[PDB]
Amino acid sequence: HMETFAFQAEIAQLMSLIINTFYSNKEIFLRELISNSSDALDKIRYESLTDPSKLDSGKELHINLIPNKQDRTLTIVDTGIGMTKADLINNLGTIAKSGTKAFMEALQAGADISMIGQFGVGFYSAYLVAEKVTVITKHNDDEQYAWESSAGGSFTVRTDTGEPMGRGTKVILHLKEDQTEYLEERRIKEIVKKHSQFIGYPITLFVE
Numbered sequence: 389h390m391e392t393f394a395f396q397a398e399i400a401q402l403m404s405l406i407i408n409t410f411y412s413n414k415e416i417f418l419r420e421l422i423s424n425s426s427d428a429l430d431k432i433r434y435e436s437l438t439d440p441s442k443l444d445s446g447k448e449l450h451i452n453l454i455p456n457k458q459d460r461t462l463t464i465v466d467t468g469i470g471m472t473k474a475d476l477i478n479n480l481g482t483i484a485k486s487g488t489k490a491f492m493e494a495l496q497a498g499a500d501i502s503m504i505g506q507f508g509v510g511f512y513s514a515y516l517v518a519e520k521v522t523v524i525t526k527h528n529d530d531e532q533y534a535w536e537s538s539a540g541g542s543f544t545v546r547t548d549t550g551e552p553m554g555r556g557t558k559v560i561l562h563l564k565e566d567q568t569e570y571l572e573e574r575r576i577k578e579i580v581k582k583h584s585q586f587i588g589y590p591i592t593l594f595v596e
């Protein structure tokens with residue numbers, strides 16, 4: 389039941405830029421994914437102020453960071469708003485295109501790759517460290533889906549039959565072979581303290 393989609397040219401070019409450009413400050417991917425999780429948590433929390441039933445799918449608002457050395461993955465889990473199928477295929481494609489255009493204009497002018505989140509496409513900083521990204525997500529208005537891409541111009545979307553999430557998003561980073569430092573407890577703790585110390589939700593760094 390896996391559907392395959394083509395990225396539009398602008399976001400495909402940004403993915404190639406992120407993968408190919410020499411840029412040593414890769415650690416900022418984690419700040420960007422935590423910021424996305426914080427934004428998604430703010431969104432469901434604000435909606436719950438008008439409709440408390442929005443939290444029937446889970447009252448806890450949190451972010452978990454889960455390293456797995458055997459699988460070579462780093463997972464960022466949140467209980468935020470999640471994404472519907474229409475967000476995954478259509479709405480976020482619209483954001484990816486306009487944000488990429490603005491970011492590329494800013495880069496040619498002299499901006500740095502670390503400013504990617506100002507353009508609403510900080511998610512794509514995952515490709516600084518991951519060869520493949522898998523997004524498992526559950527929004528209140530839709531079913532659980534898995535979006536995935538290893539770049540190369542395409543992504544896939546399928547209904548996910550994995551462990552039911554309640555609500556939120558898991559960003560699974562299948563790390564590149566030379567980026568295993570992001571599985572180490574001391575490294576993750578250092579990065580969260582440097583860039584994400586004031587996020588308004590509990591961030592639990594899991595260990596093995």
Ligand SMILES: Nc1ncc(Cl)c(C(=O)N[C@@H]2c3ccccc3-c3c(-c4nc5cnccc5[nH]4)cccc32)n1
Binds near residue numbers: 481511523
């Ligand atoms: N924790 C959490 N909770 C909610 C969201 Cl909304 C996100 C997030 O960062 N979503 C990402 C995002 C951002 C910007 C542009 C595209 C995308 C995107 C996409 C996406 N990029 C696309 C590019 N072209 C077509 C369809 C696309 N769909 C897919 C999955 C996840 C994200 N993260």
